[PDB]
Amino acid sequence: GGRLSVDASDIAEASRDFGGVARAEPMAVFHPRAAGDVAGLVGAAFRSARGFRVSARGHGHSISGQAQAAGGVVVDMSRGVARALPVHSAALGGHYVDVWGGELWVDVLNWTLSHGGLAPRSWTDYLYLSVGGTLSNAGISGQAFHHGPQISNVYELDVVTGKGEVVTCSETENPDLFFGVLGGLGQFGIITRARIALERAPKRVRWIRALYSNFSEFTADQERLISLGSGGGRRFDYVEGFVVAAEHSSVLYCLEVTKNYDDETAGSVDQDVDTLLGELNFLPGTVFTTDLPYVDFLDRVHKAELKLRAKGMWEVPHPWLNLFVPASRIADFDRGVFRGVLGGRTAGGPVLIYPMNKHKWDPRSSAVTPDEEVFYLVAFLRSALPGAPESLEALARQNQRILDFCAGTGIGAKQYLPGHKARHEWAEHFGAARWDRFARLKAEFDPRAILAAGQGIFRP
Ligand SMILES: *Cc1cc2c(cc1C)nc1c(=O)[nH]c(=O)nc-1n2C[C@H](O)[C@H](O)[C@H](O)COP(=O)(O)OP(=O)(O)OC[C@H]1O[C@@H](n2cnc3c(N)ncnc32)[C@H](O)[C@@H]1O
Numbered sequence: 178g179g180r181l182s183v184d185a186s187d188i189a190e191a192s193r194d195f196g197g198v199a200r201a202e203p204m205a206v207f208h209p210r211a212a213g214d215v216a217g218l219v220g221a222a223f224r225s226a227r228g229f230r231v232s233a234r235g236h237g238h239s240i241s242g243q244a245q246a247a248g249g250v251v252v253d254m255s256r257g258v259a260r261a262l263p264v265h266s267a268a269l270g271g272h273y274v275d276v277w278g279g280e281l282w283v284d285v286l287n288w289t290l291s292h293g294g295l296a297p298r299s300w301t302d303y304l305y306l307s308v309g310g311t312l313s314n315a316g317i318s319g320q321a322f323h324h325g326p327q328i329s330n331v332y333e334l335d336v337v338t339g340k341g342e343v344v345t346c347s348e349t350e351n352p353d354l355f356f357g358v359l360g361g362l363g364q365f366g367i368i369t370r371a372r373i374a375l376e377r378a379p380k381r382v383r384w385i386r387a388l389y390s391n392f393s394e395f396t397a398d399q400e401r402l403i404s405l406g407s408g409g410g411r412r413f414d415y416v417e418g419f420v421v422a423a424e425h426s427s428v429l430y431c432l433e434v435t436k437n438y439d440d441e442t443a444g445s446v447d448q449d450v451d452t453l454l455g456e457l458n459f460l461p462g463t464v465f466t467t468d469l470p471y472v473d474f475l476d477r478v479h480k481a482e483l484k485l486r487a488k489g490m491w492e493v494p495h496p497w498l499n500l501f502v503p504a505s506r507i508a509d510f511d512r513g514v515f516r517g518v519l520g521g522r523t524a525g526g527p528v529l530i531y532p533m534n535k536h537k538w539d540p541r542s543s544a545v546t547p548d549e550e551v552f553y554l555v556a557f558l559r560s561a562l563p564g565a566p567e568s569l570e571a572l573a574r575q576n577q578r579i580l581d582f583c584a585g586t587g588i589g590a591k592q593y594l595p596g597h598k599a600r601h602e603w604a605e606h607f608g609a610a611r612w613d614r615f616a617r618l619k620a621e622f623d624p625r626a627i628l629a630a631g632q633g634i635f636r637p
């Protein structure tokens with residue numbers, strides 16, 4: 178059913194990622210038509226004497242070669258086939274939609290909106306990412322504080338294991354494989370189908386930004402906003418934040434919130450926004466508001482992408498670092514990182530910061546979060562200058578200084594999209610109990626370590 182390709186443009190693309198550093202080439206790219214084709218290729222690799230590497234490629238958004246299969250086969254999961262329609266279940270209480278693992282979230286959104294005006298409730302900031310790719314990590318944006326990450330909004334999967342077997346899993350059947358695959362860094366199988374939870378989509382968004390010069394007030398407000406919702410009370414539907422340079426304090430903190438509304442709630446949206454904002458301690462006269470359709474809001478980062486491609490600033494190295502930081506240690510992070518490591522005239526990109534609630538993350542999954550109820554995501558999304566290798570080198574040293582700071586002060590930070598490569602680093606990342614559950618799962622579902630070897634956790 179599928180097609181092996183040795184096309185130079187296919188090899189070149191499967192040999193790079195958005196990071197622009199890791200460049201391990203495969204022998205061929207496999208283009209499947211269905212799940213049985215993926216099972217066939219993984220089956221062949223499992224049975225092969227050498228046991229060649231097989232890695233699924235979503236949209237190639239990895240930072241450090243996580244989707245590369247050195248001298249093996251990259252499965253180009255992109256499709257562009259008949260799509261399953263959203264379904265209502267009186268047992269689950271709501272809707273779901275079965276999607277192909279290679280499907281882009283942007284295409285899922287458009288499909289579910291055009292079929293019942295439905296949409297997933299937990300997003301990523303950027304929608305040109307595969308479903309299987311985000312579900313192998315977590316899938317985070319401003320909704321995770323309330324709905325949990327995307328791995329907390331999936332009912333079932335079809336997984337092609339490292340033994341080339343197709344398995345249907347969920348909380349009730351084969352749960353070990355289901356929870357293992359979720360946040361599992363592609364280690365135990367290839368997601369060929371995911372059953373995404375859906376809600377009735379809002380039609381419009383009231384998008385707000387408010388400035389702060391005091392980090393204690395900014396963090397205190399973010400932490401209060403993510404605690405709202407008891408008895409279905411008033412709350413924002415999205416809570417993010419970012420660190421801004423001065424051009425009271427030389428560092429400004431931008432709080433970013435949204436209030437989702439439809440035809441029925443259009444009347445109460447203005448009062449709801451003013452009531453929630455009134456309780457906050459942002460700088461007076463720093464409120465910036467936008468009103469736009471839901472799709473336009475969710476697609477905001479693709480618009481930033483278009484501006485970058487127009488300036489030759491998209492195909493540049495992206496040494497992006499993502500950290501989860503316990504809330505008990507976040508104040509020290511401002512002093513030491515935002516003002517310290519990144520202080521002064523440092524040479525491009527956002528630094529996002531916002532808290533989340535650990536209780537929205539299922540502890541049975543493979544995802545690694547700090548051992549604290551409230552933790553922040555700190556996303557250093559700084560890009561290197563075009564055709565300037567030294568720019569990448571300086572950003573890499575800065576990232577290592579951030580990591581050294583956390584280790585040196587005992588901040589129990591955890592890396593999201595972990596870029597570790599040594600066994601002792603992975604053991605520390607997971608901790609003893611989680612490492613044991615991880616390795617046991619690998620022994621059962623990928624004993625030959627065929628899958629996602631670019632993650633550099635296990636070796637054949
Ligand atoms: C490039 C980028 C990434 C990004 C983002 C914005 C940009 C410009 N915004 C994000 C956001 O707001 N929130 C978030 O949580 N992540 C965000 N990212 C990162 C993104 O989630 C990751 O890059 C992730 O890997 C998904 O990207 P993609 O779909 O392109 O997947 P990949 O890089 O090729 O693969 C990643 C790993 O998973 C394995 N893999 C891929 N597909 C599958 C399937 N179907 N099943 C199982 N494993 C799979 C790869 O082999 C690799 O190990």
Ligand SMILES: NC(=O)c1ccc(OC(F)(F)F)cc1NC(=O)Nc1cc(Cl)cc(Cl)c1CCO
Nearest residue numbers: 302303317318478481482497499527529556558
């Ligand atoms: N403000 C924005 O949201 C954003 C803007 C520009 C952009 O850069 C561009 F090059 F794509 F234009 C990317 C943005 N956001 C983004 O990529 N976020 C992101 C990435 C990873 Cl790798 C990991 C996690 Cl957790 C997150 C989510 C953080 O909230």
